[PDB]
Design an enzyme around this catalytic site. Structure first.
Site, PDB file in Angstrom:
ATOM      1  N   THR B  44       5.999  -2.182   4.547  1.00 28.33           N
ATOM      2  CA  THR B  44       5.588  -3.599   4.536  1.00 28.33           C
ATOM      3  C   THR B  44       6.012  -4.364   3.264  1.00 28.33           C
ATOM      4  OG1 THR B  44       3.653  -3.109   5.914  1.00 28.33           O
ATOM      5  CG2 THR B  44       3.690  -5.220   4.765  1.00 28.33           C
ATOM      6  N   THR B  45       5.616  -3.889   2.091  1.00 31.96           N
ATOM      7  CA  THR B  45       5.969  -4.545   0.837  1.00 31.96           C
ATOM      8  C   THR B  45       7.490  -4.482   0.582  1.00 31.96           C
ATOM      9  OG1 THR B  45       3.801  -3.815  -0.086  1.00 31.96           O
ATOM     10  CG2 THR B  45       5.407  -4.746  -1.631  1.00 31.96           C
ATOM     11  N   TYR B 107       3.581  -7.391  18.203  1.00 29.34           N
ATOM     12  CA  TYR B 107       3.386  -8.736  18.688  1.00 29.34           C
ATOM     13  C   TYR B 107       2.916  -8.617  20.128  1.00 29.34           C
ATOM     14  CZ  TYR B 107       5.366 -12.836  20.736  1.00 29.34           C
ATOM     15  OH  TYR B 107       5.565 -13.913  21.478  1.00 29.34           O
ATOM     16  N   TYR B 133      -0.806   3.606  10.648  1.00 27.94           N
ATOM     17  CA  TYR B 133      -1.069   2.447   9.798  1.00 27.94           C
ATOM     18  C   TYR B 133      -1.680   1.346  10.671  1.00 27.94           C
ATOM     19  CZ  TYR B 133       0.486  -1.364   6.542  1.00 27.94           C
ATOM     20  OH  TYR B 133       0.569  -2.453   5.705  1.00 27.94           O
ATOM     21  N   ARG B 138      -2.115  -8.511  10.469  1.00 30.91           N
ATOM     22  CA  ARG B 138      -0.686  -8.723  10.612  1.00 30.91           C
ATOM     23  C   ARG B 138      -0.225  -8.417  12.032  1.00 30.91           C
ATOM     24  NH1 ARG B 138       2.737  -9.131   6.186  1.00 30.91           N
ATOM     25  NH2 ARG B 138       1.904  -8.621   4.132  1.00 30.91           N
ATOM     26  N   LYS B 161      -3.219   5.056   7.382  1.00 32.52           N
ATOM     27  CA  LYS B 161      -3.351   4.029   6.358  1.00 32.52           C
ATOM     28  C   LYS B 161      -4.300   2.971   6.917  1.00 32.52           C
ATOM     29  CE  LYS B 161      -0.748   0.641   3.624  1.00 32.52           C
ATOM     30  NZ  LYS B 161       0.565   0.088   3.167  1.00 32.52           N
ATOM     31  N   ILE B 203      -2.164   3.378  -0.701  1.00 34.07           N
ATOM     32  CA  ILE B 203      -0.775   2.971  -0.582  1.00 34.07           C
ATOM     33  C   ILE B 203      -0.847   1.608  -1.260  1.00 34.07           C
ATOM     34  CG2 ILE B 203       0.950   2.027   0.999  1.00 34.07           C
ATOM     35  CD1 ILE B 203      -1.096   5.089   1.862  1.00 34.07           C
TER      36      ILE B 203
END
Ligand SMILES: N[C@@H](CCCC[NH3+])C(=O)O
Ligand SMILES: N[C@@H](CCCC[NH3+])C(=O)O
Ligand SMILES: N[C@@H](CCCC[NH3+])C(=O)O
Lengths: 292, 292
Positions: B44-45, B107, B133, B138, B161, B203
């Site tokens: 993600t990051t 989505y 995760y 999101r 996560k 994380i």
């Protein structure tokens, strides 16, 4: 000529998942013959998430070739990466598509400013009419009315698909954008009102199984015939609710199959309408007359 | 070998937005030298949303190759299409990654049952540790504790996560899974709490700018040293907040650049930290001693 009842066309797959070209042709003839104004191929309902980049344009290519100009063909081209939206959008144009529907970015939550220069870039990079798409319920971000207005001024951005289902939202968007800017509904249940508010169509899931009825209701809706629109709508309402008894398009495909128009195919993570929801949907289809 | 402070590493780009291998090198030495337990690359990051497939493994390969296996390297492989997640998970393994991180589908909102079939298939298709995760803010969906428990019995699904920031949740999952399934925090603010409850790591995003302090904190928290973990935490608290002034990783890259560790490059739809937030983040940085 993009407005009215616009079926959010499903992508049929056979039992093993390979694209079933036979069902697609019939479905196109089906909407072609029952009043549908436009077809949105490869959208949320057509399972855009699980299609090859190669599968994507082949579905866009085959519908375009069949329709042959009789109706507009809108290709789903949104992506959470600007460069990937460019590619898909360019691939839709050089394919014949009449316009592209682009959902706002999905997983990575851009800023309002970011969504602006995101759509503005695509609108500049590809010479094809693009249509904004807002549905925070899926994509965990929301394109505020201020940002819609900024994008409306852009040359290739012809309209937006408002799916929040919030009518104070459509009202606000409609009262800020031009007479050129077409506002479409992405919420079947409340589309009639959106149109009476000045909306110019409904990108629907319900149209998949009741095409003739949806075009009648959009016609009346856009005609100023508030009496008739509701009359139909309240008849179709139970189908509106049932088709979402589970994330779309899981339900609409079961129905499509129960009507004998598509094989039992759907791609993972998606599943087939779980057991418990079969009679709720079937009664809605029988009560609405689309089945027997 | 996978627990403790686990930096959710940024992917440095130059001002034109190309890969900056030189900054990535440094970063790796930085976490390598300051006590980082593990590195998550291309997550993600790390802006997984805007990387080619070829950029995906290149970055991974490079990190793995520098780490020389002294520290675990976890690759972001999740996707909203199970075939893509398989592919991405295959790239990472045949890339040297010690484990893969897989966010739930985004989505398309798969059923609980769908998510199980989803991860169960990847765990079967690729022989490499898989960490789940969950982060609804999101993905517009949420994998319930019941579904975590099912996937926990799968041979190479080593942990999850949990990013809801909901501690009652973490308690529920820890309380349902074997002592061999590890729960990691996905919320920097409450990470100390999750570990105390029985979690095995963060994380972290904060760890990007305060590595040494982050692994000190996780160590205490996993020891049982409550008083000390929460003291280091309230000290960092304003940084935990600043790093999210705008959607991650916008704020973090800024800091990273202010520290002279990476260039000013971010991929659309992402933007650079908008002007108003510069001094709040510079203060939080300086207020905490990362900056001087
Ligand atoms: N080519 C596929 C890509 C799937 C990946 C979705 N993020 C599509 O039509 O969208
Ligand atoms: N029965 C599976 C479909 C597998 C076909 C390949 N995508 C499901 O609904 O989960
Ligand atoms: N934009 C692509 C990325 C795939 C390549 C690996 N990051 C997606 O979201 O599916």
């Amino acid at each position: 000529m993009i407005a009215g009842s616009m079926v959010a066309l499903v992508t049929p797959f056979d039992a093993q998942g390979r694209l079933d070209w036979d069902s697609l042709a019939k479905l196109v003839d089906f909407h072609l013959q029952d009043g549908t104004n436009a077809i949105v191929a490869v959208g949320t309902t057509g399972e855009s998430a699980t299609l090859d980049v190669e599968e994507h344009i082949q579905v866009v290519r085959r519908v375009v070739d069949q329709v042959k100009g009789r109706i507009p063909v809108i290709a789903g081209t949104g992506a959470n990466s600007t460069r990937e939206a460019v590619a898909l959008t360019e691939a839709a144009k050089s394919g014949g598509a009449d316009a592209c529907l682009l959902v706002t970015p999905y997983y990575n939550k851009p800023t309002q400013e970011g969504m602006y220069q995101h759509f503005r870039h695509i609108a500049e990079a590809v010479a094809i009419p693009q249509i904004l798409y807002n549905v925070p319920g899926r994509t965990s971000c929301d394109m505020l009315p201020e940002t819609v207005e900024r994008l409306s001024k852009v040359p290739n951005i012809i309209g937006i698909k408002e799916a929040t289902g919030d009518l104070q939202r459509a009202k606000e968007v409609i009262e800020r954008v031009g007479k050129d800017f077409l506002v479409y509904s992405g919420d079947d249940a409340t589309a009639v009102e959106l149109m009476l508010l000045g909306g110019k169509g409904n990108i629907s899931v319900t149209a998949n199984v009741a095409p003739r009825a949806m075009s009648d209701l959009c016609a009346a809706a856009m005609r100023g015939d508030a009496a008739a629109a509701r009359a139909i709508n309240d008849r179709l309402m139970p189908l509106h609710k049932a088709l979402f008894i589970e994330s779309n398009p899981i339900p609409v495909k079961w129905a499509l199959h129960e009507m004998g128009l598509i094989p039992e195919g759907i791609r993972l993570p998606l599943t087939w309408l779980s057991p418990h929801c079969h009679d709720p949907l079937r009664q809605a289809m029988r009560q609405t007359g689309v089945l027997a």
